[PDB]
Amino acid sequence: DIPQPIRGDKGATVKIPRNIERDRQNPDMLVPPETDHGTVSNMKFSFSDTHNRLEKGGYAREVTVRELPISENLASVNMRLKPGAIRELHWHKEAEWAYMIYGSARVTIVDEKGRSFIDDVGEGDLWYFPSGLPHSIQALEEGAEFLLVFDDGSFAENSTFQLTDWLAHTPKEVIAANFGVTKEEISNLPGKEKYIFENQLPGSLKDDIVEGPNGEVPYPFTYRLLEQEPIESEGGKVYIADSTNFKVSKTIASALVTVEPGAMRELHWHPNTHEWQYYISGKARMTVFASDGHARTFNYQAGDVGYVPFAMGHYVENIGDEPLVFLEIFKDDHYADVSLNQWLAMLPETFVQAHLDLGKDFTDVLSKEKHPVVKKK
Amino acid sequence: DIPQPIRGDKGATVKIPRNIERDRQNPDMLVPPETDHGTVSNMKFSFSDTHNRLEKGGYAREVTVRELPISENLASVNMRLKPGAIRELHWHKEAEWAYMIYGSARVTIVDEKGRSFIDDVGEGDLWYFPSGLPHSIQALEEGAEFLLVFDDGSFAENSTFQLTDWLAHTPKEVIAANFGVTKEEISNLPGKEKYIFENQLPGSLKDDIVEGPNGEVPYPFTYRLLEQEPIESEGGKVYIADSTNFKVSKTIASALVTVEPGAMRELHWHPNTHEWQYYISGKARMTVFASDGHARTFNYQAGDVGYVPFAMGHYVENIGDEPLVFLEIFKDDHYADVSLNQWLAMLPETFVQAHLDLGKDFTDVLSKEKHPVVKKK
Amino acid sequence: DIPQPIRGDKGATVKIPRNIERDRQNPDMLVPPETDHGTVSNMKFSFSDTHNRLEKGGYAREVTVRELPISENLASVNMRLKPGAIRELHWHKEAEWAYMIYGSARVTIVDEKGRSFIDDVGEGDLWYFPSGLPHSIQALEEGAEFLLVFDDGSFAENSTFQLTDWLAHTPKEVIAANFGVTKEEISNLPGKEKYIFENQLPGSLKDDIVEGPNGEVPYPFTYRLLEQEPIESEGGKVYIADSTNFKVSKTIASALVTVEPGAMRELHWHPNTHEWQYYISGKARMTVFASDGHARTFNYQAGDVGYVPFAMGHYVENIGDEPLVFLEIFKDDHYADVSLNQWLAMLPETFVQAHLDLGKDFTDVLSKEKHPVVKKK
Amino acid sequence: DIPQPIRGDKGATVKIPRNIERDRQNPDMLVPPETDHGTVSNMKFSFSDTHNRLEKGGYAREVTVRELPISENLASVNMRLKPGAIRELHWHKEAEWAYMIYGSARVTIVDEKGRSFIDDVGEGDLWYFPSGLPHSIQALEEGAEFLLVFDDGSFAENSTFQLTDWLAHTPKEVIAANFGVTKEEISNLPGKEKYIFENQLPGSLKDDIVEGPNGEVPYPFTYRLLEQEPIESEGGKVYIADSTNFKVSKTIASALVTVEPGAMRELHWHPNTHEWQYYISGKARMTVFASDGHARTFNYQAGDVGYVPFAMGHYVENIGDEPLVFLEIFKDDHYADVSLNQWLAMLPETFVQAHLDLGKDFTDVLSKEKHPVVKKK
Amino acid sequence: DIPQPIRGDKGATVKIPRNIERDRQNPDMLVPPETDHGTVSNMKFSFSDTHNRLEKGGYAREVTVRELPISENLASVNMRLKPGAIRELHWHKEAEWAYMIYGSARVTIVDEKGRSFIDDVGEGDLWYFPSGLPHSIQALEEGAEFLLVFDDGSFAENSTFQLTDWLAHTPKEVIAANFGVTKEEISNLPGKEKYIFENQLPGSLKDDIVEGPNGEVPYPFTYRLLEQEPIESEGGKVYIADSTNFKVSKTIASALVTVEPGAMRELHWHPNTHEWQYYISGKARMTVFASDGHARTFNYQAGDVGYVPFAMGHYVENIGDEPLVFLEIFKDDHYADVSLNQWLAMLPETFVQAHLDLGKDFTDVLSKEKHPVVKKK
Numbered sequence A, B, C, D, E: 001d002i003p004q005p006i007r008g009d010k011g012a013t014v015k016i017p018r019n020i021e022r023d024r025q026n027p028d029m030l031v032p033p034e035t036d037h038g039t040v041s042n043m044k045f046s047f048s049d050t051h052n053r054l055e056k057g058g059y060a061r062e063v064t065v066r067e068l069p070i071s072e073n074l075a076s077v078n079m080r081l082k083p084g085a086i087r088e089l090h091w092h093k094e095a096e097w098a099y100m101i102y103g104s105a106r107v108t109i110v111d112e113k114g115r116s117f118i119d120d121v122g123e124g125d126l127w128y129f130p131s132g133l134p135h136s137i138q139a140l141e142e143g144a145e146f147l148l149v150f151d152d153g154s155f156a157e158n159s160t161f162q163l164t165d166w167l168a169h170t171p172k173e174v175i176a177a178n179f180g181v182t183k184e185e186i187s188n189l190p191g192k193e194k195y196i197f198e199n200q201l202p203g204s205l206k207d208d209i210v211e212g213p214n215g216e217v218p219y220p221f222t223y224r225l226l227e228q229e230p231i232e233s234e235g236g237k238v239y240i241a242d243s244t245n246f247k248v249s250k251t252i253a254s255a256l257v258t259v260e261p262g263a264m265r266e267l268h269w270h271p272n273t274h275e276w277q278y279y280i281s282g283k284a285r286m287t288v289f290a291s292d293g294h295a296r297t298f299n300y301q302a303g304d305v306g307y308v309p310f311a312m313g314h315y316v317e318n319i320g321d322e323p324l325v326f327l328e329i330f331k332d333d334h335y336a337d338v339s340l341n342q343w344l345a346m347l348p349e350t351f352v353q354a355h356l357d358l359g360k361d362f363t364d365v366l367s368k369e370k371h372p373v374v375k376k377k
């Protein structure tokens, strides 16, 4: 059918040419709750609304501060690799966090003491590469598709430092001197970057492990998130990875949230920093409460980026018939939330009643234990 | 069917949950031309992706620098009024330009010499209100739906100055002193803004005309764009309104462009300033050429805002079976373009051939007359 | 007596040590109108709250963006000269506008074509010196005290270019070459700036007039404001000087406003730019209406600087038993205001009634002629 | 010999490894005048200290805000073309002003009404191309070397819009549709920019002139500066070109100054805007007087860029045995200066004496006529 | 001879007046490698190109963000003191790091617990003074010349806080009250700063040591860098001082690099922060690789400051017949580099071959041990 921006006696039918498919995807934007009010920045952007860079071996598309200007500290790439295909040896200023949505991949990293780490990463696994440390990704037999987050919103995917691009713009006489070889011995070097290229599948992980004089890295750069025990509550599950458990992950804290149909990520805020969101599957709505009587509701579905500025109140409600699965990402060394429910449960009941003009029948339902995801009754 | 980001031997199928409706709307973003290259800012945003403010009497939703950060100088509201309904007497810092897409409306404006102008505006008509001059809109029997452009990208629709909001936050004793009345005589003033409110239809325009001691305004604040003779070329029509013909319109230059199926707005640029676009109907693609080998293609359809920064090369191609109708908007006192075709036609043919590695068979087709919209052969 | 921040059942007595003299000067800040609301920037600063630079011959103290951060475009100096005393030949980047509050003075200016202008300025007279044109002030037999406004808020009075400071930091060999003299002939030049210095009274103006080969300046740099016919209304008078009458005054528009006891500068705004205010005498209050339900009331008395950002609604009410006299200053080539009264008077009466929920008894009092200053009944 | 930073009893010999050639070029920086004082920004940069872009057909090197951060509004390219060689058809956001130091060249320009202008430019001639209007340069039989100034300091020479780069990043199907040709007919288009390329010498100017339906351009884009009558004074000559004589040159005012050995550009300032300088030949020093007792002396020779911020006092002294020849460039619609000598000459003599602690023997030498360049006695 | 900007068939002879001495110093800027490409900021500035402040007792000249705008975080002073001469007791906001190139000096520092440290510093020794802690320098019998680095690029040497300048601008009655003395007892205080002044040589260090009630400082503020064991490789030596060995040096990490003739600091980058460079002796070239196919080569010799932004690839090659000696400086708590050679050595050989289109003959030369400086074969 044909949705209209009408709420009781407010609003009207659209009379100009319009985008009905988009209107259908955004029911709480075309018809917001009556409780929404005031100017709030856009907190919503789709990867589908971005240019996709296509290469032999896969693709890469990004949502940055140029697409979503509220998110100045965090940016993201949706990258896809075909079986065997390689994301070229490269480095950047930004730390990089990743979540493997589909497939698997081999990563390499060498640290500033010349110690190497090589590991395979499967669905639900993470990696984190600290700023400036060089790395690669090679998809295994299924290919790979993953979400990357970089800890600067001004990140430009096209502007990373690539091995072959470095060498293509270094004098041949210097490269030859650097390695103790002749110019003729390096005449076959590529003339330009590769970036993403097709390649034969690698062999077993154990055969790739490189031994060196410098030791093992002190902490792994991968983490098996879904192998961890989640916080379990009535309507879903939360898996947290920050620097307290995934030790190397100093600038990125993360949680994978699953919300069953009829459930919601409860009313809460984060007392530490802004939240950046990626919707893996399902359909949600979220109201962002911006203080001073400002609040705005957004719709999200698979492929969307979301954002909640520092300390703004919010919830994420599943509004579909399938599980809602999304990531909460923070540029910090730890995850933290304040639960509205638990906060009030931990205060004298008469004081809460004095605030809410409600009685014992309300303060009796409050829980001193935090349940991040709650189920509707 | 199911589009995939695949171009020959480049790209791959999407393996994660995805937004197929959006992918279908953006064929040249999911599968860009091979000639696209480099980081280019987002130049595309849908009104469907914004919060819609619903009121008794209609609605208002906006695309600003908070949604589309490239557009720092220009912002826009899609406003809808039901029959008789009034957009409250108000003013703002920004100059306001409008295009009436549907219906009709009565506007009022009083200038800084106390001269008034009251006029009815129909489909295809414009208004322009200079910065800071107070005005109103009242829809007539059909209702009204129109596009507003303000000459600051930081514009916030919720933050305009409203008559009743001014009075609600002025001391009653001061209002009473201002008008020579008692506080009791103004006790019924509204306690808060109205903004948009339902009202009975007005009478005939001739009965509303207010006479004053200060004279007629020197220039009208409305303009009948579609009553003008357009530039006509093979594939469509261009109607231009800037300060040279619509005299009051000092900070906004505009053109309505119609492009037939199988036609395109030719390769050109604007030598004066950035272009802001609104797609009224149809489906388009545009490549923005950003220099230094940077170019990015965008898709647009009805309800979309587009942008072309100052001097970037572009075209707008109709990719549907219906007419493509869009507005080109500039914060300047005049419209100007440089046609790629006419530029080259006006140079010595051997000099052009020396540039393009093409011969007489090419330079023979160039035209010294500008045809803004051309038809495919 | 002892004022308390109490308004009906709101507020409380001050319980900590406090500044009672300041509280007494700010009755509408200690006890604001109930109609005030929200965060509004400070719009008020006293010259008494600034460091006064004392020199042999007088003094200078300033209110800049460093004191009043809302005023980024306009800054001000209160300067005093004793009889005969000279404000050293100097120039600056900023244009300078002045109002002579007390005494009289001789000014000199030489333009970029080598044409000179020398004139005497009395109480109520203005000068304007365009950016970068060199000038001096010498007080006559009464001394002089005047208010200066510069068209940059970052102005620093201590940082102007002085004749003798230029020469003190130029090599003697270069100064000698510049003028065709020996180094010995200029050995007595000052080692440092003078800035303000005592000097004998000058002779008659007619004896100082310098004739040159380059002609008379096309427009005078002084203006006799109080010799003009003011706009007269019931409660006071407005004298306007902008570039339309005081021709050289291209970047500063000004009005001197006198408001009788029991009168007010009516509810209005300026559709062109921000207003900067100086209170010469009397006591006032003003509410600044900042849109979106924001309004804040300020008190002012002699020696205060005030400010009203671009298009904000305001009035200035006399709250004392003596005349209120203040300047309204604008960085623009013209003065303009929109009168709330005249605006509504120029609209259909039923339309105004529909806005205000008031009837004919109200719209009957509106006046189509603007009266900037109105008297209480 | 070996210069040392020693001035009387101040300073000391350099004890670390040092750049003696640079020290020799900067005698007034290694040993500044005793009258210099305080922090002043760098106002000096050499083209010799920049990367030179070498192409088949010539070279281009630039001094921008990235080299000289004080110059935020103006940037410059030193470009060289071999005989016949072409600087590719291109456009940019910035207006472009040029001075032909060596050789000659043919320029083309087409304006936004499709009117063309084609002209030959010789040593001492100028061109000005308004922002966004497309143009080319082709050197004639002697080759050409010229100085370009762009009216934005952030200009990046590598980032201009080139004809062939536009076409290389536009879909072939779109280019074909634009011109009414087949894709096969344009298959030979270049794959990348040319920028500068070798080409056969053009024929006579008269044979290149293109006639069109749109008329002659209203104003020429070239100007014969050295054919004008200069201001002549004792020590040299000044040729001025601004928008009052070179009509199209709206954003750039310029003067070519020649200073004989033993002469100087007198003590003056500019009351309108900053000055950007290029030293064509000879050797100079200049003291920049920055107010508040700040002054710093700089050395300049051929290939140097200089700068004087808005209203700062200065002189330019020839310190070599050959003529000193330099350009003074301003982002404005007019040239203006205030002469220290003429300023003081136009004031009462006793008033000047009171300032300078000097007598009639000094004020007697002052001249009411401006002599921009003066000769030492 | 006379260098020309010609590389094979690219470039041309210079036809305008030029700076041949500078061209000779910059062979890789006049004729860059063909592998250089794109706009890169200036990364090069000479102390010889700065104003030298001369005082009785020595001199000081600086390279700041005003000279080298890329270096926003780090600034530098080249200071020289004659035997016995004192750099006045002073403090500043910035932390200060120093390297003693010539001579020796006595430093004093008192920390915020009133603990003092007094020590003599010789050639190759360092000091570090934390932000805001007061200090002095007095040259011993040889005089002293040293390089200072401050951890803010906006540093202004003329704007430090000096003991005597503090007292000269404090009321005498307050100074007298502060110390319990009469105004007459302090009447001989200087009227202005000293900054640098001549003084008799101090006695033995042991006689100056001041004992106090507050203890010894926990960490020394000097460090004997050249007494440390350097990293030794074939073509030179690297001495590192950061907060891990020179404990107080929390905001500055440093390395002294010596590169023999025919050697180079290998291809590497820094994964932590920008590098600031000072060339003590010799002649170098360095290519800065800026990503996205951007690279620019610079020449450096004694007296030059260099810069490499965060993570950009680089090498430093000795291009003279004497040792090359330079400092690498970082605003961080540690030194770190990633060696291109070691990185690739630590990866599977077939993976490296797949990247470089090179075989076993290349990957066989890679070394798992880092050699910062390598010798040509």
Ligand SMILES: [Mn+2]
Pocket (backbone or CB within 6 Å): A090, A091, A092, A096, A135
């Ligand atoms: Mn990466």
Ligand SMILES: [Mn+2]
Pocket (backbone or CB within 6 Å): A268, A269, A270, A275, A308, A314, A328
């Ligand atoms: Mn959250």
Ligand SMILES: [Mn+2]
Pocket (backbone or CB within 6 Å): B090, B091, B092, B096, B135
């Ligand atoms: Mn409006």
Ligand SMILES: [Mn+2]
Pocket (backbone or CB within 6 Å): B268, B269, B270, B275, B308, B314, B328
């Ligand atoms: Mn266009």
Ligand SMILES: [Mn+2]
Pocket (backbone or CB within 6 Å): C090, C091, C092, C096, C135
């Ligand atoms: Mn002045």
Ligand SMILES: [Mn+2]
Pocket (backbone or CB within 6 Å): C268, C269, C270, C275, C308, C314, C328
């Ligand atoms: Mn006002």
Ligand SMILES: [Mn+2]
Pocket (backbone or CB within 6 Å): D090, D091, D092, D096, D135
């Ligand atoms: Mn150009």
Ligand SMILES: [Mn+2]
Pocket (backbone or CB within 6 Å): D268, D269, D270, D275, D308, D314, D328
């Ligand atoms: Mn000048």
Ligand SMILES: [Mn+2]
Pocket (backbone or CB within 6 Å): E090, E091, E092, E096, E135
């Ligand atoms: Mn220090």
Ligand SMILES: [Mn+2]
Pocket (backbone or CB within 6 Å): E268, E269, E270, E275, E308, E314, E328
């Ligand atoms: Mn390094």
